[PDB]
Amino acid sequence: LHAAMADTFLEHMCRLDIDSPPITARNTGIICTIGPASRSVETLKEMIKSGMNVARLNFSHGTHEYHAETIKNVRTATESFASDPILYRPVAVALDTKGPEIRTGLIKGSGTAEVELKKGATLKITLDNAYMEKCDENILWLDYKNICKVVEVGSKIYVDDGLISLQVKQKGADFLVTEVENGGSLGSKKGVNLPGAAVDLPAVSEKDIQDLKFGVEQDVDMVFASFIRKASDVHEVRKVLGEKGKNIKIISKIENHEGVRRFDEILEASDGIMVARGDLGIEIPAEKVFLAQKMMIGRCNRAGKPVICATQMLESMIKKPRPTRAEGSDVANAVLDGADCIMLSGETAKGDYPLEAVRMQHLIAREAEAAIYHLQLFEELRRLAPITSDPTEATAVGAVEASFKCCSGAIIVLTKSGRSAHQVARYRPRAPIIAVTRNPQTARQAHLYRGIFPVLCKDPVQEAWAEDVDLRVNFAMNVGKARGFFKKGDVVIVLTGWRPGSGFTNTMRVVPVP
Amino acid sequence: LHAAMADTFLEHMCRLDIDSPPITARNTGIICTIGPASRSVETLKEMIKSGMNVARLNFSHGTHEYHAETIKNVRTATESFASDPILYRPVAVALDTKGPEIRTGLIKGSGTAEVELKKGATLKITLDNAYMEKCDENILWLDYKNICKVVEVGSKIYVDDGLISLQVKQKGADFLVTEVENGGSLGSKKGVNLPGAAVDLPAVSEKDIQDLKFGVEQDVDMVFASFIRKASDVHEVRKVLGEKGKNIKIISKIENHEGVRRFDEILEASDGIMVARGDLGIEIPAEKVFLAQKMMIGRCNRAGKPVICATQMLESMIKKPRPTRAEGSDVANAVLDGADCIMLSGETAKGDYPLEAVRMQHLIAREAEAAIYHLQLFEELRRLAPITSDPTEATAVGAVEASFKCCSGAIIVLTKSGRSAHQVARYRPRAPIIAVTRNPQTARQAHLYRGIFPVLCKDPVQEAWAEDVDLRVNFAMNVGKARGFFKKGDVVIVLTGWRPGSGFTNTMRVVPVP
Amino acid sequence: LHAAMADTFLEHMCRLDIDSPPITARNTGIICTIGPASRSVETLKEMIKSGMNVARLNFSHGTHEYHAETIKNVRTATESFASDPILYRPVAVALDTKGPEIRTGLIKGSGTAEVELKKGATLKITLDNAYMEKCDENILWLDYKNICKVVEVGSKIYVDDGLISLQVKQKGADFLVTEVENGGSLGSKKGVNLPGAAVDLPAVSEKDIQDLKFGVEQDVDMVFASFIRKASDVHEVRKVLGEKGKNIKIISKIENHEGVRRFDEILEASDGIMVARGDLGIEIPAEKVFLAQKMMIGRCNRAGKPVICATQMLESMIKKPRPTRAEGSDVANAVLDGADCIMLSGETAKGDYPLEAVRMQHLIAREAEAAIYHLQLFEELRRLAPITSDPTEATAVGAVEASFKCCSGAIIVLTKSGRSAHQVARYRPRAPIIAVTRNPQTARQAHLYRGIFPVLCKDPVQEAWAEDVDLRVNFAMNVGKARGFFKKGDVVIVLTGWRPGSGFTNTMRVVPVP
Ligand SMILES: O=P(O)(O)OC[C@H]1O[C@](O)(COP(=O)(O)O)[C@@H](O)[C@@H]1O
Ligand SMILES: O=P(O)(O)OC[C@H]1O[C@](O)(COP(=O)(O)O)[C@@H](O)[C@@H]1O
Ligand SMILES: O=P(O)(O)OC[C@H]1O[C@](O)(COP(=O)(O)O)[C@@H](O)[C@@H]1O
Ligand SMILES: NS(=O)(=O)c1cccc2c(O)cccc12
Ligand SMILES: NS(=O)(=O)c1cccc2c(O)cccc12
Ligand SMILES: NS(=O)(=O)c1cccc2c(O)cccc12
Structure with a gap:
């Protein structure tokens, strides 16, 4: 099939063709920030089409009533397309606490x-x-x-x-x-x-207690915690959200010098990191910011957590309908280090061209994912992984390795909490990872992990449990096909469990697409 | 001394500290374009101080008389600082032909x-x-x-x-x-x-025959050949320059789709490549440009030729005195692939802040050079190098390898044509490469190769030839010290020849700084 | 010149041609044990011709008078060939203490x-x-x-x-x-x-105090210390030898289970290790011995010390004039791990065929040295070496690296104590290492380090010290040529110092053979 990749990273680089079309899949999510330019239900519908997967509400400015009208909208548009269960993309909401x-x-x-x-x-x-x-x-x-x-x-x-x-x-x-x-x-x-x-x-201000507490009532899918210095701040947010919102994912913004200096403990406390280049570049010298970003995405890949990457990404696209070269090769360059998803701020909230700025982050990320040098990244991610007895881990590595060898067009994984998917994405497989869940929420927070392309099954539960698994797989084929991730007579890897429940994924089959 | 570097590129990344100060040296040159904002002799003096090494004259707009006043200026300022022979930086001029x-x-x-x-x-x-x-x-x-x-x-x-x-x-x-x-x-x-x-x-237009022919009369140090499609165009420029300007270095601008598609033959014809992101990004889709740049710097590293990298690098710094994050991590990111030197256009020609835009490209490049992962780049550049019997090649690799092991603060190389230096820089040594030449021109075109920091010796030729070598070395120590690349009792590698002439470098000594 | 070697160890293996003739040099020394079959001056002369470099006297059996007649002989034959100063091989003596x-x-x-x-x-x-x-x-x-x-x-x-x-x-x-x-x-x-x-x-028995004390009087070149359990035993031998024999090299025999278990401290105490497979294979299970040998040669390569490897190597060649296959591929297999020199016992002391058993260890080692996979061994030995400021170390690594690249036929090194040579051999260069010493003793103990082929200069000291260096180099060319390690117009690396003395090697030149 596809010829053997280069033996070295310099050889690799030299071989990059620009006449070689990329996969139809796109592995890194796109977070838009919702503002005046993009609160309308027509705009949001049109955005979702372009490739938006996280609507991010900014709890700096505006009242509680004003944001609720925004969520109401994001949802109205998300739910427009849910007539056709195959083509329905789900869409996370996220709350950006103002901070201290x-x-x-x-x-x-x-x-x-x-x-x-x-x-x-x-x-x-x-x-x-x-x-x-x-x-x-x-x-x-x-x-x-x-x-x-x-x-x-x-x-x-x-x-x-x-x-x-x-x-x-x-x-x-x-x-x-x-x-x-x-x-x-x-x-x-x-x-x-x-x-x-x-x-x-204080870790949470007086205002941000009402905000977080508002966001649990409004059923947001993750919280972007601003100004995080210690692991104890991340632990404060987790307290306020309470057992009523104990699912909601906390992403800490690393923002100050101290935040970086203690990075390693904050990570072991959060559910994923945001590198907030905006603020970071005042609190430390602009010429250094690049290193803090590399470092962080670095450590976050090793730990297996997702790293969002933010701010000034396509800044000139507030005013002009095309980016500068710098803006192009900064997006491509996060995506290459292994930023898990990327952020538009001004460009989507405030600019004249919100749809274009998305369409541009779509095309860019997509080409850049096809330039990653897998068969030396993968090999390093193995060496740096602990030998454990956990079935789910063993199956997920095996499933990735297979995927390489057969050039497989996807990896269907039946999830429930999401964890089964999350392990596979910890290896950065070249194939897209269709995950097939019933839990509507699991579907929304999948958008964080790079690779995972979640799909929500509405088809009611069959009697015989084996036949309920076979129904879900076949969904994931009909979804992959109508999207273009594979055709008939292609080849897909399918992860599954042995009993029903959570945490019994052990089976990896390798099937031809019906 | 310095602790053992990481065993893998992911381990490497994760270890990047932002509290670790970099070397005083800066390995990638800075090309300014001279326009209205920076034709004055006060501005140019002040620029040279900031870190400008190539003044690039743009032969699109303006008359032959107008450019000559610009060169006259660049030289007046270059030659201001030549009273103090130790602190004198030399400064290339370069002519950007308008093209077809x-x-x-x-x-x-x-x-x-x-x-x-x-x-x-x-x-x-x-x-x-x-x-x-x-x-x-x-x-x-x-x-x-x-x-x-x-x-x-x-x-x-x-x-x-x-x-x-x-x-x-x-x-x-x-x-x-x-x-x-x-x-x-x-x-x-x-x-x-x-x-x-x-x-x-036609490869050279009617206008560009008068221009090139003007630039040989004005004694420019290199020509940036615009719109290069075949190896035969590069061969046309070489003809027009004639035996009167047979030293002048031709850098082809790759600008169109065909240029990329035939890259490999154009390289084997030029003296170095310019990736001109500006134009390249119209003639092909903006989302792909990033790959063409990587590819090209790639191949240019393997071939051992210099690759300039250009356009939109710090674009927002026409209007505002600080860049955007994208602009920061695009400069750092060329410097990491192994762009040999980088270009400011609008930011220096036309902007309100020419000095800042230089000072910013100085600081950025400098930190980024300290993030390069040497002890896996170097090892690849060896494997990809031909086994030949040529003394000069063998000495230059040996000299680099030594430099690693003793953590050496510099590599003095006595040159004449420059070739001895050029071989050492083909390995991307972490140490700066002081080259010590008498040929005032060799000094100017050194600014292309990444690493080389040329110094021009004016001290008249001694009688006994061994003592003339010992005079030149000692210059290169007094220059390294007054700059800060090493102190007393540090350790430097010194390449030298055995007879006088060109092409007899064979000796590599390892000396303590007096 | 020679084509690029394989990218992997499996690729490497697969490419081994048996129609490809090896270098004339032979990098691993040969130690014969002297007994009845080989005490005669005719036999010893003939042996020295075949490739014997260490005569090992076995202080188990026989009286002090009987051994002295043996040394007297070894020396008479060594000194036969010393008429022709170019073709004179020097020959170490070594004393194998009986032990507890x-x-x-x-x-x-x-x-x-x-x-x-x-x-x-x-x-x-x-x-x-x-x-x-x-x-x-x-x-x-x-x-x-x-x-x-x-x-x-x-x-x-x-x-x-x-x-x-x-x-x-x-x-x-x-x-x-x-x-x-x-x-x-x-x-x-x-x-x-x-x-x-x-x-x-006790570390030294009553008998072995008279023996060691005998061997200092007889001016032996190294002592093979038997039954070494702690670093304190190795320190006992060093005491007995006294300041009168403070040059004599101590090689500990690792012989018992405890010896292996504490290997790491014994090494840091000795001047080199002997893996004595004979005894080791009783004190622990025969099926394990192979692992203890690998381990040990392993650690000894990392530490930079020499490891002799001994016993049963060509055992069947006591009785029959050709070895068994097992005997062939056991010799080749020590030489491949990086045993520094190898031992004949019965085969040379007691057998019917002493000359053949040498001629066989000559041919075998020689082919096996040409199968070593350098350009992945060398690269590992670098990574595992400390970054220090010591000139001599930096020059020796550089000199090896050069040698690769120019395919150089030798590395002349002017020594005095031997240390300059010893550093170069710590890298396992493919080229032979001619070392050129005046110290007749340094010449004899060079035979331990793998690679080094010592030559003793008798030519009296010139007045002008630079001209005394040029005399010694030219010897090392005339010796390399009359041996066949290179011809005219070949290419050699030459290490040298800057002042006279010991410990000022800093210069590495790359010269064509006159
Ligand atoms: O990612 P999670 O939470 O481990 O989900 C994995 C589970 O999904 C399944 O494949 C599907 O079963 P369910 O019908 O219980 O969702 C189980 O067999 C398996 O243990
Ligand atoms: O880089 P090039 O052109 O080979 O110059 C190298 C030459 O420089 C020297 O070191 C200095 O000698 P010169 O006095 O002739 O410049 C020569 O010994 C050597 O061959
Ligand atoms: O291996 P050693 O003991 O450092 O010997 C190295 C010495 O040999 C020399 O090259 C030869 O000088 P000598 O005449 O003193 O032997 C010195 O310049 C150098 O320091
Ligand atoms: N950009 S990349 O594909 O070269 C890359 C990104 C992240 C980690 C890598 C790694 O660990 C090894 C090689 C390339 C990597
Ligand atoms: N940016 S970098 O230091 O990772 C790098 C740049 C150019 C070439 C490289 C290579 O061949 C191997 C590893 C890193 C490289
Ligand atoms: N026998 S060999 O040439 O494969 C070899 C011997 C010793 C060490 C080696 C090493 O560290 C890496 C590869 C091969 C080695």
Whole structure:
């Protein structure tokens, strides 16, 4: 069939043809953020068609009533296509908690006033509530009260997303006094970031307790936890969600210097990571951000967890209907490291071209998945995996290995919680992974793991349990075919259990497509 | 000293620390394009300080007199710093030939008029010189006369850089008739690209014969040959430059579909390749461009030739003083594949922030060079190298291998033509490669090869030839030290010859820095 | 030149041609043991011609006067060929200390009497000196007095080299009582081995103090230390040899179960290891011996120390003038793991065919060295080597790497202590390593390290030190040529120092053979 791949990564690279068409499948999910440009039910319907799999609601701005109208919409459109059970794509919702902040007071007493900070001028920073609504050039008010026990001398404060830096000269309780390093106009209520620091602010703010608690009532499918410093913050979110929402998946945003520095414990606490390049690139030097992303996707692949990758991905596509080259080869380049799914923010929320920005992330990811150098990635992922006695693990590795050798067009897996699928995707198989579930929710959170293309079975449960398995498999063939992942007389791997239940997948059969 | 690097590329990735400071050296050159924003001698002086190594003059717009004033400037600034012979960086000039084009005539007879093309409307394209200066919606004039023997039915024509596509329906000599696929306003004298085609236009245009011939008179250091389809075009440029400019280095721009498809022969004809992402991304689908870049840098590493990499690299830094994340991790990502040096266009020619855009390409490249996974790249580059009897080759590989093992802070190489250096850089040593030449020109074209940091010796030739070698080495120590590539009591590898001449490098010594 | 070697070890194997003639060089030394069949000066002369490099004197049997006549001979023959300074091979001597033993007394009072031990019969073992010279079937006397504090219940005793095993049933001080497991006739004064045990006998016996002390007076080149259990035994030998013989190289024989179990510390104490398959295969089960050999040569390659490999190598060549296949592919198979030199015992001491047994170990080793899979062995030996700042190390790795690439016919190294050579051989270069020394002793102990082919320079020291180096190199060319390791216009790597002394090798030149 397909000829033997290159013996080395340099040989591999050199052989990349651009006349070679890719598979119809696309292995990395696409998360859109929903805003003004894309809250309408016509737009959302049209987006779902283009390849959107996670609608992400941004709980920074807008009221609880405003978001509910958005979810109501996302669902109306998701559920339009559910007449034809074969062609129905399911669609996750996700809630992006606002997080902790430090904030500036009202400058000169006004609502929107400007102050010029020079490149050497001295600033006292007072935590007394008298100077807010009378903030000047000389005296600034910080929202954060506990700053002086955190910030040491030399530690810089970045203001208004790093437009203004300033270096701390002397701290004497109630006030720290600083020399300003970067200049420009300052406003009122503008966010403060203090690099290299261990900030003490509460893990969930007062606002974000109502938000998470709102999202369990609204039945969201995952929560994107903002500003995560310790494993204990991730454990706080898990507490608030409570046993009523104990399924909801927590994805921590790594956002600050401390977050990176303690990455390894946060991972062992979350259900997946988001690399939030936006904020990360203020709290540490922009020229380094690239390394933190690589590192993180790295460790997340080894651990087997999903890593979303976010922010500024196709930024120029707010204004112009085509991206720049940089934007093209940044998307392709996350997808190559093994980002699990990728994020559009401004481009889908606010831009003139929401449909295009999706259609573009579709095409790009798709070609890039065909450039991955499997038969040296796979071989490394094996060496780095523990020898255990667990049937499900053994079957899932075997199923991947087979898939290579027979060039198989898919891997049907019957799931229930999703875990059976999740193991297969831990190996990055070249074939797509149709997973076939009854649990409507399992279907939605599958969109995180790279590879898995979930399908929801509505067909009511047969009497004889063996015949209920044979019904579900045959669904997954009729779905693969009407999509184009294989034809008749092709070859598919099918994972299955031996009894009914969860956690008894042990059988891997290799069947020709009927 | 430095601990043993990871056993695998996934292990490697996972270990990338962001608290680990990089080497003071920077291995990939920076090419600025000189325009209005950066023709002044104050700006250029300040740029050279930031890390510019190739000034690229763009022979599209402007007259011969206008460019000469630019070169005169580049040189005045280059030569400012040549009082202090240790701290003098040399600076290449490079000439970007305009190339062949196809062009539209004057619409409606006017200088600047607009015509709306709909999404299905029919167009005749006439090559009769009557319809130019009277071009309408229905009839368009093409500069190219020989189009009908090239373009077949189905082949699309992209107009105004792909704003307007149109598909060819019937060709009947003198005129081809088309259905328009993409809509929008069209102008007068706007460039035509015809994908998937083998275009017959002359290799050097009439204009570009005067340009190349101008650049030999002005003593440029390399020529960036635009629109290169065959090895015979590259051979045409080499003819025109003549024996008077037989040193000048030809870098072919790969720009069209055919260029890629025949890459392998063009390489064996040029002195190095430029991947010109700008144009490449119209002539083929934007989602594929990434693969053509990888492929090309790939093959160029194996062949040992330099590959420049160009266009849209830090595009947003025309308007705002910081890049987007995409722009950051696109620069880092060329540098990781093994782009040899990188290009700023708009950002340096036209933008508000030319110095910043350089300072940013400096910092980025520098961190990214410290993330390269050497002790599996090096090992592959060996396996893929021919066993030959040539002393110079054997010494250069040995010198690299040593450099690994002793963690050596540099590799001094005494050159003359440059070839001795060029072999060492063919291995991508982690250490910088100080090359020490008398030939002022060799010094300028060193900036192409990745790693090489050339220094020009002015100290007059000693009597005893052994003592002339010892003078040159000691220069390269005093230069490495005042830069920071090593201290006293560090360890450097020094390549040298046995007789004087060219092509007798055979000795590799390993010395402690005095 | 020579085509690129296979990408994998299975591919490698499959490509082994038997029509491909090997290099004239032979990289693994040959140690003969000198006995009756080969003490004559005619035989020894003829042996030296065949390829003997270490004469090993066996200090078990014979008096001090008898051995001295043997050394006197070995030297007379070594020194016959020293008229022609180019063709003179130097020849090490080596002393095999008898070691500790446990021994049986005189059976039935007689000099040579027989006793039948059945397969279940009970034996008391008494340490009272009354029962010796009256040893029976029921009561046996052991030389070892301290046995009962060492041997526990279950520990088997092997007698007469494991002809008779017996298992210990009850130990009650002064006597242990046993059930016999293997049957056959027993004699008087026949050696006892007690498996799995930590034996307390002195490191150097009373006899072996006179022997070592004899060997320093006779100026032997290394000592083969027998029965080595701890690093403290190896440290005892080093004490006895004293500062008068502080150069003499100690090679520990690993011989018992404990020896293997503590291998790692013994290595860090000795100057090289001998795997003594003879004895090892009684003290542990014969089917395991193979693994202990592999393991040991293994660790010794990583540590960079030489491993001799011994015993039963060509055993059938005592009686018949050709070996069995097993004997052929056991020699080839040590040489492939990376045994550093190999031992003939009976075959050279006692056999009818001493010259043939050498000529056979010559031919075999030689073909086998051409089957080693270098360009995956070398690459592993690098990864497993520490990054240090030591010039000599860096030069020696570089020199090996070069040698690969230019297919170089030799590596001349000017030594003095030998250490410069020893580093190069730590990499297993395919080329032979001519080392050129003035120190006549350094020349003799070079025969241990695999690869090194030492040559002794007699030419008196020139005035100008640079010209003294150029004299020594040119010797090493005239020696390589008259041997056949290269011709005119071939290519050789030459390591050298920068000052005179020891430990300043830093220069690696790559020269064409004059
Ligand atoms: O991914 P999970 O949660 O282990 O689900 C696997 C289960 O799915 C099945 O294949 C299908 O059975 P169900 O009818 O219980 O879903 C079981 O045989 C198996 O144990
Ligand atoms: O890179 P090239 O052109 O081979 O130059 C290498 C030459 O440089 C030298 O080291 C310096 O000698 P020169 O004085 O002739 O430059 C020669 O010994 C050697 O052959
Ligand atoms: O193997 P060793 O003991 O380091 O000997 C290396 C020495 O040999 C030499 O090359 C030869 O010099 P000598 O005349 O002192 O032997 C020195 O330059 C060098 O340091
Ligand atoms: N981009 S890639 O396909 O080269 C790649 C991505 C992730 C991990 C890899 C690995 O562990 C080994 C080789 C390539 C990898
Ligand atoms: N970016 S990188 O360091 O992983 C790399 C770049 C070019 C070639 C490589 C290769 O041949 C093998 C591993 C990594 C490479
Ligand atoms: N016999 S061999 O050439 O295959 C060999 C011997 C010793 C070590 C080796 C190694 O580390 C890797 C491959 C082959 C080896």
